[PDB]
Amino acid sequence: MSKVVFFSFKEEDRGVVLTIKGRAVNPSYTGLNFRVKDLLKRWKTEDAAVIKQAISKSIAGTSRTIVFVGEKTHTSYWVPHEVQTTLNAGKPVYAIRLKDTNGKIPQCLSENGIHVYSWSEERLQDLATRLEHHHH
Numbered sequence: 001m002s003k004v005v006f007f008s009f010k011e012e013d014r015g016v017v018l019t020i021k022g023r024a025v026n027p028s029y030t031g032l033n034f035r036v037k038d039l040l041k042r043w044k045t046e047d048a049a050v051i052k053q054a055i056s057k058s059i060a061g062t063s064r065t066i067v068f069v070g071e072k073t074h075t076s077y078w079v080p081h082e083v084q085t086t087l088n089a090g091k092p093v094y095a096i097r098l099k100d101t102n103g104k105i106p107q108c109l110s111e112n113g114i115h116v117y118s119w120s121e122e123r124l125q126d127l128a129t130r131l132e133h134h135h136h
């Protein structure tokens with residue numbers, strides 16, 4: 001695995017997202033297996049310039065972004081910038097629901113035609129590793 005995934009999420013889902021990450025990076029846990037960038041710790045701000053500066057380097061050390069959709073991800077001010085920063089760098093954004101959640105789809109996913117997949121480990125592993133065709 002030569003590439004790294006960025007995890008984009010609402011902070012109230014940190015606990016569950018930390019377990020996803022830990023499973024993915026633990027080589028003996030085979031249901032998830034890929035590299036993950038150290039998670040950002042976000043805070044309450046609506047300043048676009050601050051958010052963009054806070055996420056820039058982290059996202060830039062990664063090759064794709066996965067948005068985890070929980071109950072309140074649609075309210076995040078950070079997730080839309082994490083999505084847009086990824087897409088503007090020409091990288092893919094995928095999205096998956098967290099297990100046993102059914103949140104409103106964030107506008108930044110709808111707006112970009114990014115499908116929000118049902119939860120499963122097999123599907124996350126696919127979103128984390130699949131490659132697109134050039135000019136796609």
